[PDB]
Design a protein around this ligand. Structure first.
Ligand code: 8N6
Lengths: 257, 262
């Protein structure tokens, strides 16, 4: 029995890494290799126009700021399905009450999207179209109000988050901790979700201790980032309030809400 | 790959349960009175219709009010079906125009597939299982509405004879959505490749769940011919209705679906 707890936690961590690799083809490791230095760079309106020829976008059915926002929504819809697939491989998740599964995902996917978005970001821009393109932070910032300000807070979060230097094996456990959050509103069976999250937290803590021995209290630091993810999501939900009440297919509208 | 196809089948069943509150299993339980709950209210004539509208809980003429009730149920189903479609692996990665086309052309085929789950040869469950409207009452409605539901009943009787359950239907409805022959599709092969995988998953599901049912896979695919004819004939009936009725306020969602459809 000596060492068996450790071994079980490392086995869970490896299981989550392996499934994360299957659910998310464009890993942080691959993204960082692209970002450090080939993708087509969109750095202004003109290069965005030629970018449309070099890259086949799937969301084009208008004004440039609106098309970019719709492109981001298309990608987020794809990410919801990748995250839902990944969640099925979190031990315990599929055996939960079906309604609680839906609830956990409804509230979890946005926090996860912005966590994983940081893997594709550096301080100067973001990979798009599976690494085929790179859009500068400055170009996004330049878009007309209120679209100039919709990606900037995500960049702010990502620069700080990426300074933790987490890798894919760390993130796989962290995103599972996020999904198994017992405090989402409307959950029927809270105790089993907390039990699963307890074991995931143990696994995350041991993973960070072994992978980042030089990083004092990285576990605590990473848990604290949950306050900023929740801030980012809340703030982002408010901005989606504006866009639907100041800006402007019926099936298309259905696909997304 | 066997385990991949079983994992696909289980994923679709789960998302089907998440997306469709009134399953065939529940519809069947109500139809045969097997669990708790009080029997549904039976509407078999004009007097029982009048009272059913009082107990079960805005045109004035009866045939139009029933037709509009069917339209409202359809809008609801479209919302459930589109929610389901997003869960089909690969669907949301398609060109967005093709996503819209697949839903435009698939949604009624699925509506009539799942309508069969609420039908027997004598009538159809309505209002979330709180009512049961008889087939003979529906056939009594004035022209051209006495012919509205009858072809759907003819389909349901033949389709229900296949004895599918919800786990079978979840894969079947995904096969319907991922049809590469819809008019106006831009990227056909990505859709066909997905449907190919769904067809492999459906074939294995039928062989495991229905080992004694010879050629059930083929017989189920043959019902796709019958579903297409129900939809195209329903569009025909809509053209007759346009000529026989005064204003028909059609829900805008149905307006877009029907726009330039057959
Ligand atoms: C209380 C009136 C009533 C309530 C629901 C049903 C059962 C539903 O049968 C249906 C029949 C047709 C549809 C398709 C509807 S009707 C139409 O023109 N377009 C549609 O999408 C959808 C459901 N029967 C009678």
């Amino acid at each position: 029995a000596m060492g068996s707890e450790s071994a079980d936690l490392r086995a869970l961590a490896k299981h989550l890494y392996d499934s994360y690799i299957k659910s998310f083809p464009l890993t942080k490791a691959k993204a960082r290799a692209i970002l450090t230095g080939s993708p087509f760079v969109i750095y202004d309106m003109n290069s965005l126009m030629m970018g449309e020829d070099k890259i086949k976008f799937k969301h084009i059915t208008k004004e440039v700021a609106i098309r970019i926002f719709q492109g981001c929504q298309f990608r987020s819809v794809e990410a919801v399905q990748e995250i839902t697939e990944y969640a099925k491989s979190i031990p315990g998740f599929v055996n939960l009450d079906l309604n609680d599964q839906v609830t956990l995902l409804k509230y979890g996917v946005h926090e996860i999207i912005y966590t994983m978005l940081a893997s594709l970001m550096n301080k100067d821009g973001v990979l798009i179209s599976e690494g085929q393109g790179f859009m500068t932070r400055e170009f996004l910032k330049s878009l007309r109000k209120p679209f100039g300000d919709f990606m900037e807070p995500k960049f702010e979060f990502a620069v700080k988050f990426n300074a933790l230097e987490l890798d894919d094996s760390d993130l796989a456990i962290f995103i599972a901790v996020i999904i198994l959050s017992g405090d989402r509103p409307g959950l029927l069976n809270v105790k089993p979700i907390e039990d699963i999250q307890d074991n995931l937290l143990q696994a995350l803590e041991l993973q960070l201790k072994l992978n980042h021995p030089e990083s004092s209290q990285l576990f605590a630091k990473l848990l604290q980032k949950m306050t900023d993810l929740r801030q980012i999501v809340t703030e982002h939900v408010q901005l989606l309030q504006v866009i639907k009440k100041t800006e402007t297919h019926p099936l298309l509208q259905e696909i997304y809400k």
